[PDB]
Design a protein around this ligand. Structure first.
Ligand SMILES: [Cl-]
Ligand SMILES: [Cl-]
Ligand code: NA
Ligand code: NA
Lengths: 306, 306
């Protein structure tokens, strides 16, 4: 019993983190086989960031302009290329600790573990969700660029996020490992800002199921709702509409507790319209939306990883 | 920017997790150098657990009655002993992945990361605090015994907790790595219950400083209080008394933000006596007490260079 924000074990990713230096800039890179992936803005000076011509800036660079350090060992760069917003540095050594991996672009609402790194050295791990507005509410200090987010699937480590920048409100923007930003953000100094956000309804329901699994039941009722009527209430409270796909993904938690998804929706409708009346759920006085259905399953069933 | 429940990267501990089997019982062990540490209750049947004579049970077992599996490799047990509530299995191979490490005993209010494991394999990592009543509000299922809690400082893992049991309210109890329980708990099946818990005052204050750092200021006021006057209010609200040592520990955060410790106490006194009136602090409607002052500095400022 118990329910905590729980990250995936980070060891397989820790063994892939390196330090990348170009000119006066140092950040983090991801070393998989004989390639190091990092944000392409490592090649930019402060002046360059105003309107960087990345193709021109990269043409002027050579392999020796890039320093890669894995622990206390220098890896010599023997090639460089650019894929969207990610720099790929071919190095003289394949990472002997490379896990089975894939690059996956996640959807808004889905969570991942972030391994916050500085100077190529992992410093902490925590859970984040990709918000509907395509930002993450991370915790990152100077030097954190290139830190990565990941999940572990049944097959392998699934890298989904590379950290690029902090937005004015203190939330964070980055790319997948193919270098495509989540959301409309760009790796230039512009006026860009996060748009309005929305609460991830399927995750709130998953967390209510986690609460029932853990013995918190006061919010269950005998009321019913249709999916349409629930979604109208959800929209009033700036929750995302719940799709039938989301209902289907909640199936395993519905089965584990014996509470049909639409009955949990009737509970959530009352919570949105009436609040908690001084009660708590899993120790919280607010509804939590950064656990996915699978996050609840992996924690409440004790799934383990390679 | 940002503030998250942040754990230490788990890789250095993952490399030490093994599976220990005695009879029909399997749990987790910690393999450091040529010793595997695990809860001694691994030697008990359910019937033994009612009133176990551990000395007698252990003296009648031989080395070959213990199976230790590290990944797919069987380790050979060449000796065994009991130190308080921890069993120590000497094996004929030193763990090549042994990190720099220490065994430390923590105090209530201090935090650590937990690598929850099942059958010697890692499930997830989370952060928690040792409660004033010496339990931890963990996330643990059957099979998780022998999972460890730890802090990491400059590549050195300080192990502070080994998991032994879940208590009737669903909170968790365990030992230091020398086998001494935290709190009034014993490794036998008996009616034992956690005592009444209290809130970790110094940690709430630290979190309020984290909130100021992250831009929250509404709870700051023009009021003042003495340490003795504040502690009169703290006692009324089931908060631990605040000591001058706690005030000294809060020194750096106080100087960094310009908010005297006793002025933050005045803010906390107002929060306890009046509530939040519909507002939030760091996106929470309740006061958080599982971040220490050092945890706040580590996350918002970083670790100093050695
Ligand atoms: Cl913004
Ligand atoms: Cl061995
Ligand atoms: Na809350
Ligand atoms: Na109890």
């Amino acid at each position: 019993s118990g329910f905590r924000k729980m990250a995936f074990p980070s060891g397989k990713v820790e063994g892939c983190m390196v330090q990348v230096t170009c000119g006066t800039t140092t950040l983090n890179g991801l070393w998989l086989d004989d390639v190091v992936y990092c944000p392409r803005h490592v090649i930019c000076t402060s002046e360059d960031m105003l309107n960087p011509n990345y193709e021109d800036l990269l043409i002027r660079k050579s392999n020796h302009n890039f320093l890669v350090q894995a622990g206390n060992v220098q890896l010599r760069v023997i090639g460089h290329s650019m894929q969207n917003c990610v720099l790929k540095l071919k190095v003289d050594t394949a990472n002997p600790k490379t896990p089975k991996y894939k690059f996956v672009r996640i959807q808004p609402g889905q969570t991942f573990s972030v391994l916050a790194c500085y100077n190529g050295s992992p410093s902490g791990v925590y859970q984040c969700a990709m918000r509907p507005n395509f930002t993450i509410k991370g915790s990152f200090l100077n030097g954190s660029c290139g830190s990565v987010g990941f999940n572990i699937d049944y097959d392998c480590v699934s890298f989904c996020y590379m950290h690029h920048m902090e937005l004015p409100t203190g939330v964070h923007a980055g790319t997948d490992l193919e270098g495509n930003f989540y959301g409309p953000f760009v790796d230039r100094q512009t006026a860009q800002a996060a748009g309005t956000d929305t609460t991830i309804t399927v995750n709130v329901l998953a967390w209510l199921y986690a609460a029932v699994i853990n013995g918190d039941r006061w919010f269950l009722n005998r009321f019913t709702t249709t999916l349409n009527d629930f979604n109208l209430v959800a929209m009033k409270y700036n929750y995302e509409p719940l799709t039938q796909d989301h209902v289907d993904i909640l199936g395993p938690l519905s089965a584990a507790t014996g509470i049909a998804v639409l009955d949990m929706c009737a509970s959530l409708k009352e919570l949105l319209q009436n609040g908690m009346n001084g009660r708590t759920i899993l120790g919280s006085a607010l509804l939590e939306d950064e656990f996915t259905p699978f996050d609840v399953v992996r924690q409440c069933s004790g799934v383990t990883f390679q």
